[PDB]
Amino acid sequence: LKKNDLYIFDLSEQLLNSLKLMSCSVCQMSHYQTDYHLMNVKRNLRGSPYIYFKSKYVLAIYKSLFNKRSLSNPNEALTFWNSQENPMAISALFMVGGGHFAGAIVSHQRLNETLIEQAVNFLEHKTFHRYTSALKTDIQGVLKDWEPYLSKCDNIFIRARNVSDKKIFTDNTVLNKGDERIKSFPFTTNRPTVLELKKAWCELSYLKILPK
Ligand SMILES: [Zn+2]
């Protein structure tokens, strides 16, 4: 099992149907890495920490990736993720700290910087910095700018250790406080840069092989 065979949103049917839990519509065209499909996706969008499976000698996936209020079980989630019927699956990624910001809207679809990082498709991405907040209006600007994307996101992952910095994302913005989709990163992360957003994404979106 190479890492290429472990992307949670692109698992082969053999690997999927083996997993055991431990206890084109947007183009009107009948083509997924083409730049055409990507703009149409863009146009239409714009208007223990783990769970374990058994198979081929223990695959682990982050609990944060799932929807807590969901009646589906994790196998049902994985199979729905791996079906062409969710081509506009997106998530958001935000880190702020020490005057630095990086945000991105990430597509769940992969592509052709390591090869694993080179396949992360950021539909939008922004990074800026301000000494000191005054960052607050800048970031509230990005959130309004991405409002159509944000209302269609599966998850919105935010790192803001500072209490005033976490307040930046919900104090009178387009995100509401107590939005289930808003979640911490289940692992420590570095400085807010675009590459760090991709590190975080690859860390959430690939199964991990662990001991039982
Ligand atoms: Zn298409």
Side-chain angles (χ1 to χ4, degrees):
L1 284 172
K2 308 161 305 175
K3 199 180 199 220
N4 245 333
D5 311 327
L6 292 174
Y7 189 64
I8 289 159
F9 302 117
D10 194 4
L11 306 163
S12 65
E13 203 192 19
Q14 194 204 45
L15 177 51
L16 214 42
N17 277 21
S18 86
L19 293 194
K20 313 290 197 169
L21 175 80
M22 174 169 311
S23 178
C24 175
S25 35
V26 75
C27 306
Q28 309 180 35
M29 169 190 155
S30 51
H31 165 51
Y32 259 93
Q33 240 173 258
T34 68
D35 293 320
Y36 187 66
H37 180 88
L38 265 184
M39 307 173 79
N40 272 314
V41 162
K42 220 157 176 199
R43 137 153 177 179
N44 190 27
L45 289 169
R46 203 169 171 92
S48 172
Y50 299 124
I51 282 184
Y52 307 98
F53 302 89
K54 316 193 233 159
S55 45
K56 299 195 163 61
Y57 240 98
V58 185
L59 288 157
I61 183 173
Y62 277 108
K63 284 154 72 168
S64 295
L65 276 194
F66 299 96
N67 176 336
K68 289 283 180 172
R69 249 158 274 148
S70 185
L71 296 177
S72 303
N73 62 53
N75 283 93
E76 292 177 320
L78 284 171
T79 176
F80 171 80
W81 290 344
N82 298 273
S83 55
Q84 304 178 48
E85 82 168 28
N86 212 23
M88 316 203 300
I90 59 181
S91 296
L93 313 168
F94 292 109
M95 305 170 193
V96 64
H100 302 278
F101 170 83
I105 301 301
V106 58
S107 146
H108 296 191
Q109 194 84 338
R110 273 189 318 174
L111 302 181
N112 252 31
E113 222 164 63
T114 75
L115 296 314
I116 289 296
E117 287 143 8
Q118 212 178 352
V120 181
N121 184 10
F122 278 170
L123 302 189
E124 317 282 1
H125 69 95
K126 221 90 190 180
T127 67
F128 42 76
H129 157 83
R130 272 197 207 287
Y131 312 94
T132 81
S133 55
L135 210 30
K136 185 195 184 170
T137 60
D138 289 317
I139 285 160
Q140 290 185 162
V142 177
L143 296 187
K144 173 88 78 181
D145 206 330
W146 291 352
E147 176 173 46
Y149 293 118
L150 291 172
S151 57
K152 307 171 169 76
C153 280
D154 276 39
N155 299 295
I156 300 159
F157 289 109
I158 310 193
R159 171 162 70 57
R161 287 160 308 250
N162 214 26
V163 63
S164 73
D165 291 349
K166 185 71 185 215
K167 196 192 170 177
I168 300 179
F169 293 85
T170 58
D171 174 359
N172 204 34
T173 73
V174 304
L175 301 182
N176 307 123
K177 214 206 150 198
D179 175 322
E180 172 163 53
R181 298 173 303 158
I182 296 184
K183 304 170 184 189
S184 286
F185 288 92
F187 39 79
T188 64
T189 42
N190 278 259
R191 339 184 331 108
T193 87
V194 154
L195 181 89
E196 176 58 57
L197 292 184
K198 302 193 170 192
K199 180 270 157 185
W201 184 243
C202 289
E203 178 55 44
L204 289 155
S205 59
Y206 287 85
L207 296 180
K208 275 219 288 294
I209 300 185
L210 296 192
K212 193 196 190 176

